[PDB]
Design an enzyme around this catalytic site. Structure first.
Site, PDB file in Angstrom:
ATOM      1  N   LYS A 289      30.285  30.517  26.706  1.00 44.09           N
ATOM      2  CA  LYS A 289      29.920  31.904  26.894  1.00 44.09           C
ATOM      3  C   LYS A 289      29.944  32.566  25.533  1.00 44.09           C
ATOM      4  O   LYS A 289      30.947  32.496  24.824  1.00 44.09           O
ATOM      5  CB  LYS A 289      30.903  32.610  27.856  1.00 44.09           C
ATOM      6  CG  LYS A 289      30.610  34.113  28.040  1.00 44.09           C
ATOM      7  CD  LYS A 289      29.377  34.314  28.905  1.00 44.09           C
ATOM      8  CE  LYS A 289      28.816  35.723  28.799  1.00 44.09           C
ATOM      9  NZ  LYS A 289      27.911  35.858  27.625  1.00 44.09           N
ATOM     10  N   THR A 290      28.834  33.202  25.175  1.00 45.23           N
ATOM     11  CA  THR A 290      28.695  33.844  23.877  1.00 45.23           C
ATOM     12  C   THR A 290      29.136  35.305  23.936  1.00 45.23           C
ATOM     13  O   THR A 290      29.280  35.893  25.017  1.00 45.23           O
ATOM     14  CB  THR A 290      27.223  33.819  23.427  1.00 45.23           C
ATOM     15  OG1 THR A 290      26.420  34.451  24.441  1.00 45.23           O
ATOM     16  CG2 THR A 290      26.746  32.374  23.236  1.00 45.23           C
ATOM     17  N   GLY A 291      29.314  35.891  22.758  1.00 48.08           N
ATOM     18  CA  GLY A 291      29.511  37.322  22.623  1.00 48.08           C
ATOM     19  C   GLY A 291      28.913  37.733  21.287  1.00 48.08           C
ATOM     20  O   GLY A 291      28.948  36.978  20.292  1.00 48.08           O
TER      21      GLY A 291
ATOM     22  N   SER B 247      31.041  39.875  24.790  1.00 49.06           N
ATOM     23  CA  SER B 247      30.724  39.327  26.102  1.00 49.06           C
ATOM     24  C   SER B 247      31.486  38.060  26.474  1.00 49.06           C
ATOM     25  O   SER B 247      31.338  37.561  27.595  1.00 49.06           O
ATOM     26  CB  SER B 247      29.227  39.061  26.238  1.00 49.06           C
ATOM     27  OG  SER B 247      28.559  40.241  26.597  1.00 49.06           O
TER      28      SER B 247
END
Length: 260
Positions: A206-208, A42
């Site tokens: 922003k994480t993933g 993501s």
């Protein structure tokens, strides 16, 4: 020294760790496996929102345009979009959902408005990123299979691309600021880079998260009194548990604080 500490951290992580640190005060770059490919998961959503805003800047999209959709469009992990199958959502609302809660349906709807993964990839090529590629839609793009180049970036390419979009002049000042505001308001990253930074440091991230023990976080950070630092962190093939992978990324945050 940061480089050597990152190598020790990688041993603790049970996987493969990629990190890039770009200091905009000095232009200095520090990297560990900076040119190896890693699954974005993501983290790509930050690039997606940028590509939509670039269209707004050109007068080809509007933030207040309403997009309508049905239950059939919903994929899993759609905390915001599932509540609005009835009334639809604006482009701005979808960007915000996609970034701050990692809403998967919001990402698919925005991708369709752009022309799909190929159109996003073309936008990246147009701004000078020759490496990053998006190939699939949600939720399949999170497979994160080792050796598969689909849906990957490198930590160095991602850091340069973020610098260009968030801090350079590829976007209008209103678009850059709005995108930064969404990153700063992220709700999914408390256990990752943010957990390693003092409270007074301003951070947008922003994480993933994906298969094969993949846990990522990308960020722009403003230490007090200073120009900002872009940090990208990709961890994959990791055999420790999800909480331990988060702690690895938080420790990268602590190393950065020590170094700057």
């Amino acid at each position: 020294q940061l480089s050597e500490q990152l190598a020790e951290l990688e041993k603790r992580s049970g996987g493969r760790l990629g990190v890039a640190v770009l200091d905009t005060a000095t232009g200095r770059r520090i990297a560990y496996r900076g040119d190896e490919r890693f699954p974005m998961c993501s983290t790509f959503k930050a690039l997606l929102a940028a590509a939509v805003l670039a269209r707004v800047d050109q007068g080809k999209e509007r933030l207040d345009r309403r997009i309508t959709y049905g239950k059939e469009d919903l994929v899993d992990y759609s905390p915001v979009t599932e509540k609005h199958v009835g009334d639809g959502m604006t482009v701005a609302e979808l960007c915000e959902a996609a970034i701050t809660l990692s809403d998967n349906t919001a990402a698919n709807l925005l991708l369709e408005a752009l022309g799909g993964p190929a159109a996003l990839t073309a936008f990246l090529r147009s701004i000078g990123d020759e490496v990053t590629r998006l190939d699939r839609w949600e939720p399949e793009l999170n497979e994160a299979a080792p050796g598969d180049p689909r849906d990957t970036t490198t930590p160095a390419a991602m850091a340069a691309t973020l610098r260009t979009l968030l801090l350079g002049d590829a976007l209008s000042p209103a678009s850059r600021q709005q995108l930064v505001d969404w990153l700063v308001a992220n709700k999914t990253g408390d256990k990752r880079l943010r957990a390693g930074l003092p409270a007074d440091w301003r951070v947008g991230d922003k994480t993933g998260t994906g298969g094969h023990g993949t846990t990522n976080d990308i960020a722009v950070i403003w230490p007090p009194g200073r120009a900002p630092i872009v940090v990208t962190v990709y961890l994959t093939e990791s055999q420790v548990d999800a909480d331990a992978r988060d702690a690895v990324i938080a420790e990268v945050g602590r190393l950065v604080v020590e170094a700057f």
